[PDB]
Amino acid sequence: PIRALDEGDIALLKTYGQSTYSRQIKQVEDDIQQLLKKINELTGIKESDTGLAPPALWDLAADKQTLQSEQPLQVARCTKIINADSEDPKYIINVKQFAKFVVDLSDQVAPTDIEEGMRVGVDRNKYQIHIPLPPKIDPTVTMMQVEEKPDVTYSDVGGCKEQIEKLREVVETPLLHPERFVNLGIEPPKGVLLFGPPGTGKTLCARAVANRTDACFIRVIGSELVQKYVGEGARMVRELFEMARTKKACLIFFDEIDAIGGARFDDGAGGDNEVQRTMLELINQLDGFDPRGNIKVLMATNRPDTLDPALMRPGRLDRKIEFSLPDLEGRTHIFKIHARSMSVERDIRFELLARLCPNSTGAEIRSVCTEAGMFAIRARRKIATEKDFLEAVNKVIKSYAKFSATPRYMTYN
Amino acid sequence: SYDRAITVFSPDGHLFQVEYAQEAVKKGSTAVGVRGRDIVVLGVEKKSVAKLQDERTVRKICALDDNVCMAFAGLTADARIVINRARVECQSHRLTVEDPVTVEYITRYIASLKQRYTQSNGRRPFGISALIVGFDFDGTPRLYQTDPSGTYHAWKANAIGRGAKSVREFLEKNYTDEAIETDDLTIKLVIKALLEVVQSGGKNIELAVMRRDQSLKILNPEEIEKYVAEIEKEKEENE
Amino acid sequence: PLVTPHTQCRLKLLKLERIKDYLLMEEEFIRNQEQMKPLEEKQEEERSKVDDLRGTPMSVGTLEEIIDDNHAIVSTSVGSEHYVSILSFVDKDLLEPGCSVLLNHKVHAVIGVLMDDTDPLVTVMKVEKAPQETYADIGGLDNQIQEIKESVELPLTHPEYYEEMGIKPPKGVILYGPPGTGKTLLAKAVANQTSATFLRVVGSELIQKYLGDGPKLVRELFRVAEEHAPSIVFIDEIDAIGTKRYDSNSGGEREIQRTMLELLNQLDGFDSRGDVKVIMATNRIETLDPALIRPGRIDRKIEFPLPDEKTKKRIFQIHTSRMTLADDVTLDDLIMAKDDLSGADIKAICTEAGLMALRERRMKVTNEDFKKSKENVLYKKQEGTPEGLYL
Amino acid sequence: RLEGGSGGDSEVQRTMLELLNQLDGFEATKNIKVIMATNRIDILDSALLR
Amino acid sequence: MEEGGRDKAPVQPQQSPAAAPGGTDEKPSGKERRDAGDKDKEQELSEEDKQLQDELEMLVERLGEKDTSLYRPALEELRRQIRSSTTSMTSVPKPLKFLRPHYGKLKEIYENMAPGENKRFAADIISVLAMTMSGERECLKYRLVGSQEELASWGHEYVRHLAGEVAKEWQELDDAEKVQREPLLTLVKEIVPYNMAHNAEHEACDLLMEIEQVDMLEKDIDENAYAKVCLYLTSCVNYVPEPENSALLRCALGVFRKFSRFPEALRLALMLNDMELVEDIFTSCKDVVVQKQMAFMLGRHGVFLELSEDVEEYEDLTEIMSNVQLNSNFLALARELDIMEPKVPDDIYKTHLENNRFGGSGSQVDSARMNLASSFVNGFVNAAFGQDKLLTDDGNKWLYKNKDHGMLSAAASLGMILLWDVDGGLTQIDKYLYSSEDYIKSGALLACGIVNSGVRNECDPALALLSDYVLHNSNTMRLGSIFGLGLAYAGSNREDVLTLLLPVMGDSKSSMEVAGVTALACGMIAVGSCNGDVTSTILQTIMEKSETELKDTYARWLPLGLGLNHLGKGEAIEAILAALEVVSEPFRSFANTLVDVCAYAGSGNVLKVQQLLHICSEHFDSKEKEEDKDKKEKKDKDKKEAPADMGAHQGVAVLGIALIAMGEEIGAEMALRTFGHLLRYGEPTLRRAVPLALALISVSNPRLNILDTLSKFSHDADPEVSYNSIFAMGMVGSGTNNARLAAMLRQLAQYHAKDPNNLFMVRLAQGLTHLGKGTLTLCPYHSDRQLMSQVAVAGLLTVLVSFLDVRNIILGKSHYVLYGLVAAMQPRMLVTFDEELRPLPVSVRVGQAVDVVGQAGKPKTITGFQTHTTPVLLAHGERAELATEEFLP
């Protein structure tokens, strides 16, 4: 009692039910999708640009003064120099993508400005040094040494003023008053790392005093020190710490040092593939070239796993400044920050809100202020009410965070 | 995340083992109950009989005294002890003090029994939640409930069991400011509320009423079938 | 998308033959376009000689830095860097570090700059066809449909509301929940009804093995998303590219982790995102890196639960629409007896009950086919319950 | 699906997810039928069992 | 696959019809009684439509096909009963006996003799027996008969009543969505004689139902959205009497037989206008039938309601004509000063405040042609009672400072300030009238025709502007006087002032622009009769345009009023009239494409659209007839704007591809005026497709061609967020895209989206889809922009006040007689429901909810609830009447 379908039994299904419009509606839909294809290969519009110039100015350029750049001009490569020798060159040079070579200089130069760690012009066949070139100054530093005013007010990161007061004492007081250090007989600290929960004010307290420095400031991408090519990131961190120590009163901000970090004084450090090239070179140039400097460097990360005790050996890094949560008055200050710049009611109170935000960051406090506005968009409103924020705190904190089972309450009132 | 002892506070101040007992309530059968003008009523959601057993031993509604009722959730092992204990206390009260037992006195006993049973290690708390209904205290209809934490508490309408949240939200839009007199109207409220059951088979409802002077009256599945018919009949007239 | 009879009616015969008429004519108009062009050109002397002044096998290179004295420093594909001249017809304004150029073989000089063209890997990941049906296809999810439409469609169609209060729109949205709930449906339905460029990336597309190919594509994918529209980037199952950041020194996990780090960086690049919306979707949320989940990066978290006994009525309404339903069935009974089957469960029931009618040789579907479909499909997972213990 | 790698596998996870997304991803492909055969039913993942 | 052992029916009906030639001769009983036992059992094994598998019907004909080929013909002595037993038993399996050439032989078993009453064994079965087979008859067999030989044999004679009872059987058995199978059957059978099929099907539908009318009622008009010419000619007049005879819903007469006015006969809807004057009960449906008859699709009805009942039943006419027009003024007077608007916003100009800090300083723009656009900060925002004493001082100084064409323009702006006004409009002009200047009075008195436009009462049929016209010995007094009165009486088809202003054409005073706008003025008036207008125009055409080969002042103005005099009829006689009338040289055969497709406003006539492409497609055409391919593309723009988005997706698919992305002077000069003519709601597909070709200005051409495409990129009404595109392009349009030429234009585009807050409905779609022209006022401007030199001198007559048919906006008012009700209305994204489960949900966007005068928007069928019954016309139309009834508790 299962039966399967014979060939005549197939024809019962396939016939019954609109046998006038079945294929009539179907092959029209079938060949139109064929026709969607047949337009597309028929169109095939795609064309090139290839970046030419208008022929008003290049026709005389396209004369023999292209061949004068073809055959007289050359195709010389660039490299780096390890070192030199005395009274005779015997220079040691890496292509580093090809091999390392022991070469000579060509006759067109003087042996003075062929110093170590320099870009030079290298012959294709005889590999002689043709022209010494600059280290490509300066997009390797000044493109992150922006020297530009950021749009962060001092009143934006209010509520954590004592952690600011730690950082205001460490950074500002030697850079503008190294006089009471002489009047008392002390020297300033020169190492501070930042760690703690994400979205706490790390980049804010960095950028607020980067706004209040009137001076050189450098922000450093953590993945920028990670490179594709082996032996390339160390060469970069060479060029950063050299040309930042040149001018005075500058700040460098390391950020997300998880990729370049890890305890190298402790059990691990079994790495050594282009991460340690960056790492061993920076800890080389962090001390050694810094007794009694002028440029302070700050690190910041979300993971306190990657603390190096060799960094925390004094001379490199001294102080563990971490950030915390606001008690209440810090939070009520922050709610006033993220709600003064939007269409609100003049009668809401914010101390009721920070009661409902026990363990929360200003990232979450900002998220509530945006979410409460989103409830005002749901209805036709243009100003927020009290209950707009009250639904937002319920939507943010009492939904995904560490409190559930609200109806079974009945033990506490 | 220590949830393995009952005498420990969380660092935000909780007792999770008390909180885990109330999750065991939510796997229990639903039961609702309102108080009326004179006649109180409660109803349960009875599960399907498995075709080969007697059904007089699946009792979910019991009476402690001659004038007070009881409906529970949770698990029947812990429910049987609390019922058997509270029958003694409402009887021993009558011996020591010659009155009948008020509905408020017996809920304080059940809550205090569940109270002192929480505090010591090696005493796993009662994972049930009770509904205590009785028009006993001198013609005054009352209904209370309990909680596995041991907090007795007074409502005017109630729902427990799986998906009681749907029923409690249903009653607030349904329990009128009009006190439903004409007590078949009040029974029609509960049968309509339990008609918003998790399944609403129609033949799976047991309602129990008390007209404040008689004994307990278990309804019959022909009279209860009459009230389900008029609910669908009056709902068709609303269109 | 107006085939609205949805049945065997002469309207859809009339509707589709209109569509056949306009596509045949647009074929025949462009057929006459490449036909009736008598041009027979002769190239200009300047253009013809420069095409012979350049090499015939031109090679693609990469700018690194620029010296304006008609010779600069470029890089090959292998990274060999050359002090080549740049010819004086290259339109010397497009030279920015990172732009792609064309090179010679003899002196490797910059023949001409190439427009910002990308690899074929990312061009596959750009959607050509609007896939499937609109919001009427899904069976009642409107609490969450109204969420995503505020975050994606409303800021594009009508960004008047936000400037009325000075509130920036949300940036990233994560869709999570049990599987078979409709996470992929809502991605397809948004990609149906939109004017944005919709990018389809699925998880482990993005992982390769040439030591830089991982973090290169993220820069290329979001360059394409930046240069094109107010755009939608849908990355699916990001749990395969993000979990809690361990850093074993072996060179297998780093290529994951370096790519994992730079995507989170290129997310908040903040240079000019230019309204690029990112939609992410997994099943489990607990095994995620908390650096992704935090606000500032992703603002919306959306649960897709096993719904209710109410929207099931709509899914059984939808998935039984195109079939000859017999008048003996009470589909509420199937919703009544069960509590935790999903939308993909319903569609499997609707196909299986149709197969049972073919077994006993019918077209209409009785109540009994749904009874046999429910027993056949469901009993493969249901394991573990304390019956008798509770009541 | 286990967690991230300390005792995590985390690489055939990527390969499984592509099997899970190249047959029910963004495009419902056609004329392709798979036949999968194994014992140990209770331990294979409940996302290719849906 | 355990078969065999229970195969009863593959054995005994395999043997007994095989023994039927063994028992036809020498067995008179077994010939008959085994046939009867075969026939009822085969009938019984098909009636349940839960066994489509039939144990005989695909079992017997394996030998039974060769049997019936030797049983039905070869018997040759067929009795009166055995034919009723053979053909009733053997015409059943023949769709499944035979393959796809069954279509010639559904008759070689059946039409030997149709046995009696074939539905007697085919009543309760839906279509498995013969109803699909009956459609197989009418598809191929009847059409080859009824191709030229409709009046024919049994294949028409009995087939008439055969299809009569079958069409009854679709609404008999289950009354399901097979109701719509009846127009599927009625229209395949005798496609051109559809009415001859429908005449029986009209009366059958009259007695069919009065509840199962309405979905078939809308099924017809959905098929009447597009058809062939003669089919759209046929089924639309079949559509008319069904709410007239079967039902009396009947408030769908006026607008939904304006559907049938121009195709079938103009007097036929006038007989339906007489059918309006028949069913005069009582007032409320009568009120709203005649609400649309003045300023929603046509005017000119003020001559037929001054008959013998002039008390209130025929005193609705003047109430319709100007009083509810003035009550519509009371919308913009009362209700819209309430919702948003004080008298002068004047600050879209001020919204260009942030520009002066963008890049240092400002105050660098001093171009005098920008002061043309300075008139529109006062000009466009003061529509609908933006009356301005001394806020016109920016006008009043610049009127008295320079710029004669701006003296005419600022004087023409005053008519837009007092729009839809008859109460005190001329008194505003008279104080600013007497400056005794050519440009001031010719702008002001042209604006007087704009003031009383849409009124058509006694203001000045020949009082003011005819006296202004006879002042002519000179400039624009000669020009500007004829334009405004023809603009005022465009809604009428009055003959008298047409003959007053025909000696303008007959003067032969050779002011070329005056004669050009003369064709524009008379074209706005009439769309039908008075062929002497077509005579009077072509006389001066052959006098002037023959003796020249020069500018489109000839070409853009003179043949256009011809097509405006012959708009909207797919008869293709008007092409035989006009194109054979102006048989001439090809620069006068530029006019060949005009009156051809001006008669082709909107339908599906795709065969015209291929001759709209294939004749002048590209040809590479070195600068001779390049205007003609633009104007051939211009007529592609319409016949696209009302199949209701069916071809609008195809139109944007074609014209984006093979035009601007594959074209020449056709694409990159002119082919963007489609998007300024196809829709003007705005949606980011095409609204962002234009800055693909605008931010790329492509400055190598005379870039004001592409900056013409800048201008009417903002030809989309209903104010939006598009300010981002315009103000940013104005910032790059200050220095570059030089302010000598288009600093007027960008701000003309900028100040046009926010014209008022409201009053944006100019888009030729009322109720659901009818035209209401409308087109005669808009289409002159897009014909006018070809291309340049009317940015300075001549087009300033046009570009300010070309299109002036804005009808009101909103469907919020209630008018229950005292006009006190508000409503509870519920606005939503428009209907999608065509045929689904009854009752069908009308819309889908339930969230927004208003009560009263809120907005119209693009996709809004706003409905209402709360048992107010909304009974009026049940479509909509913005002057609902709204009675009251609640008999459902």
Ligand SMILES: Nc1ncnc2c1ncn2[C@@H]1O[C@H](COP(=O)(O)OP(=O)(O)OP(=O)(O)O)[C@@H](O)[C@H]1O
């Ligand atoms: N203490 C605070 N005071 C004021 N605003 C805060 C504070 N903490 C967070 N915010 C809000 O959060 C954002 C700052 O987050 P922050 O830059 O500290 O993240 P982060 O520490 O860089 O995160 P991660 O370390 O994961 O990169 C700001 O936009 C601000 O609106």
Ligand SMILES: Nc1ncnc2c1ncn2[C@@H]1O[C@H](COP(=O)(O)OP(=O)(O)OP(=O)(O)O)[C@@H](O)[C@H]1O
């Ligand atoms: N709410 C629903 N309404 C209608 N159909 C649904 C619904 N939910 C699921 N389906 C059906 O289930 C199929 C799969 O859903 P989908 O894959 O989008 O869920 P998912 O959460 O993405 O699952 P996964 O994460 O495992 O891919 C869809 O093709 C759809 O037909």
Ligand SMILES: [Mg+2]
């Ligand atoms: Mg940060």
Ligand SMILES: [Mg+2]
């Ligand atoms: Mg999926």
